[PDB]
Symmetry: D2
Subunit: 116 residues, 4 copies
Amino acid sequence: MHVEAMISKHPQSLVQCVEMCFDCAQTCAACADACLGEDKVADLRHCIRLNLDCAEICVAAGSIASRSILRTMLQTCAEMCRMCEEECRRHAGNHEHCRICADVCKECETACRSAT
Amino acid sequence: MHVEAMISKHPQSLVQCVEMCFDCAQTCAACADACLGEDKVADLRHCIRLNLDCAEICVAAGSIASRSILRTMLQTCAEMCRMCEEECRRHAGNHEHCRICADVCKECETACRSAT
Amino acid sequence: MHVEAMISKHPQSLVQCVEMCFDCAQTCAACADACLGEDKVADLRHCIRLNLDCAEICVAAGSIASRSILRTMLQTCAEMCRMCEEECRRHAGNHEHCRICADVCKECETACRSAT
Amino acid sequence: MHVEAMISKHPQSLVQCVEMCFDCAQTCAACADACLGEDKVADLRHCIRLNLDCAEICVAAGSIASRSILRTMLQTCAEMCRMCEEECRRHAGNHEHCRICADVCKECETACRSAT
Ligand SMILES: [Cu+]
Ligand SMILES: [Cu+]
Ligand SMILES: [Cu+]
Ligand SMILES: [Cu+]
Ligand SMILES: [Cu+]
Ligand SMILES: [Cu+]
Ligand SMILES: [Cu+]
Ligand SMILES: [Cu+]
Ligand SMILES: [Cu+]
Ligand SMILES: [Cu+]
Ligand SMILES: [Cu+]
Ligand SMILES: [Cu+]
Ligand SMILES: [Cu+]
Ligand SMILES: [Cu+]
Ligand SMILES: [Cu+]
Ligand SMILES: [Cu+]
Ligand SMILES: [Cu+]
Ligand SMILES: [Cu+]
Ligand SMILES: [Cu+]
Ligand SMILES: [Cu+]
Ligand SMILES: [Cu+]
Ligand SMILES: [Cu+]
Ligand SMILES: [Cu+]
Ligand SMILES: [Cu+]
Ligand SMILES: [Cu+]
Ligand SMILES: [Cu+]
Ligand SMILES: [Cu+]
Ligand SMILES: [Cu+]
Ligand SMILES: [Cu+]
Ligand SMILES: [Cu+]
Ligand SMILES: [Cu+]
Ligand SMILES: [Cu+]
Ligand SMILES: [Cu+]
Ligand SMILES: [Cu+]
Ligand SMILES: [Cu+]
Ligand SMILES: [Cu+]
Ligand SMILES: [Cu+]
Ligand SMILES: [Cu+]
Ligand SMILES: [Cu+]
Ligand SMILES: [Cu+]
Ligand SMILES: [Cu+]
Ligand SMILES: [Cu+]
Ligand SMILES: [Cu+]
Ligand SMILES: [Cu+]
Ligand SMILES: [Cu+]
Ligand SMILES: [Cu+]
Ligand SMILES: [Cu+]
Ligand SMILES: [Cu+]
Ligand SMILES: [Cu+]
Ligand SMILES: [Cu+]
Ligand SMILES: [Cu+]
Ligand SMILES: [Cu+]
Ligand SMILES: [Cu+]
Ligand SMILES: [Cu+]
Ligand SMILES: [Cu+]
Ligand SMILES: [Cu+]
Ligand SMILES: [Cu+]
Ligand SMILES: [Cu+]
Ligand SMILES: [Cu+]
Ligand SMILES: [Cu+]
Ligand SMILES: [Cu+]
Ligand SMILES: [Cu+]
Ligand SMILES: [Cu+]
Ligand SMILES: [Cu+]
Ligand SMILES: [Cu+]
Ligand SMILES: [Cu+]
Ligand SMILES: [Cu+]
Ligand SMILES: [Cu+]
Ligand SMILES: [Cu+]
Ligand SMILES: [Cu+]
Ligand SMILES: [Cu+]
Ligand SMILES: [Cu+]
Ligand SMILES: [Cu+]
Ligand SMILES: [Cu+]
Ligand SMILES: [Cu+]
Ligand SMILES: [Cu+]
């Protein structure tokens, strides 16, 4: 990622938040698709949905963070990540993709809470 | 828009919120580009930035609203729209694109506040 | 939508393309969620996936169209819409949400092909 | 990034493409804002615009790549990155943010061309 490089070269920490929003975005988008592909998919609906929302909010939060609504947006992104960690945590026993994503969600929650 | 058609045919008002999020998304994306094209662009930086953020948040809010983080997300989208109305309102005298967008922002703010 | 209002007030048809990209975006996002909620969800995986991709591409295509990659992007958005119409058409007999979305996809395909 | 972790744990190289799409997304979003903040902003309009489009296409391309339109989408994302490298390359002498972003664009172009 080039968050740090770019944030020092602009004419006018948070770095961690941005790295993580894009990381967590990609990851939940991956997890939605993985859950969608499972045989027990019918049981994963809420998880897929949350993953889709967490992807969307993290892209949004990370783009904004790359440029104020930011405080608010990072609170929201923190709330979302937590919702999505909790759900992805449930499935961590049976699905390795939800262990991986649940931890990425945890780390991005942390990162949004301390950015505010 | 087909928000209303689709929301009645799902196996499990808010309609207005969704219509407006996508409307206001496109509009602020249009306004960012219009301000970017102005001769007084150097004076419009904050407005362009807000427009970009309002586009991003409204897509995000509208997608989520099409599928919970929703309450929170709609509060955030309400806060953003207001921020962006206020700024786009400043420029309504001189720029017709900011009159149009400032009103779209007002109407979407309204719509998010009453969706919550 | 305010595509037409805004495109006439910028300091520097396609309108139909933009209206439709945002319409079709919201619609496929709605259809993904509707299919996700079906009992036969396990059979709808490819459709949900395509709907997610068509939502993403249409937002992208519509934002770009609101501001060149445009020709290319509209070809891609045309290809996607067609892929997603074809799949959503399959399910039009059994699911009213896929009849609605399959037609929105058809109309946006048309609109991208004639924008190029 | 957790592209690699997740792509091995799904029930059904490209990794490089995805890492890079999200990297290049964040970077061009950063560069748009940096150019927007420059005194010579009036001269950077085309660059800002391209950066905005490259951000949008790369998010889109990376999300899709995380889940077919993919071949097509990656061609488009390759075309965009190149357009945006070329423009960001122009400004590499005077602006360090455009040197950084022009190279991120180059590396993501490469990565999309070999993913296809
Ligand atoms: Cu973040
Ligand atoms: Cu996040
Ligand atoms: Cu985030
Ligand atoms: Cu995530
Ligand atoms: Cu998952
Ligand atoms: Cu899941
Ligand atoms: Cu998630
Ligand atoms: Cu997230
Ligand atoms: Cu988050
Ligand atoms: Cu997250
Ligand atoms: Cu999750
Ligand atoms: Cu899960
Ligand atoms: Cu999972
Ligand atoms: Cu998960
Ligand atoms: Cu996660
Ligand atoms: Cu997850
Ligand atoms: Cu998440
Ligand atoms: Cu976060
Ligand atoms: Cu964050
Ligand atoms: Cu809304
Ligand atoms: Cu809105
Ligand atoms: Cu909104
Ligand atoms: Cu707006
Ligand atoms: Cu504007
Ligand atoms: Cu403006
Ligand atoms: Cu706005
Ligand atoms: Cu907005
Ligand atoms: Cu809003
Ligand atoms: Cu708005
Ligand atoms: Cu505004
Ligand atoms: Cu303005
Ligand atoms: Cu304006
Ligand atoms: Cu405006
Ligand atoms: Cu506005
Ligand atoms: Cu505006
Ligand atoms: Cu707005
Ligand atoms: Cu709204
Ligand atoms: Cu709303
Ligand atoms: Cu379009
Ligand atoms: Cu479309
Ligand atoms: Cu489109
Ligand atoms: Cu669609
Ligand atoms: Cu559907
Ligand atoms: Cu479907
Ligand atoms: Cu679709
Ligand atoms: Cu589409
Ligand atoms: Cu399309
Ligand atoms: Cu479409
Ligand atoms: Cu479809
Ligand atoms: Cu379908
Ligand atoms: Cu359907
Ligand atoms: Cu469908
Ligand atoms: Cu459709
Ligand atoms: Cu559809
Ligand atoms: Cu579609
Ligand atoms: Cu279209
Ligand atoms: Cu189109
Ligand atoms: Cu990529
Ligand atoms: Cu890229
Ligand atoms: Cu890309
Ligand atoms: Cu980029
Ligand atoms: Cu830049
Ligand atoms: Cu630039
Ligand atoms: Cu770029
Ligand atoms: Cu890009
Ligand atoms: Cu690219
Ligand atoms: Cu790129
Ligand atoms: Cu560039
Ligand atoms: Cu540049
Ligand atoms: Cu630059
Ligand atoms: Cu640049
Ligand atoms: Cu770049
Ligand atoms: Cu750039
Ligand atoms: Cu780029
Ligand atoms: Cu790329
Ligand atoms: Cu790529």
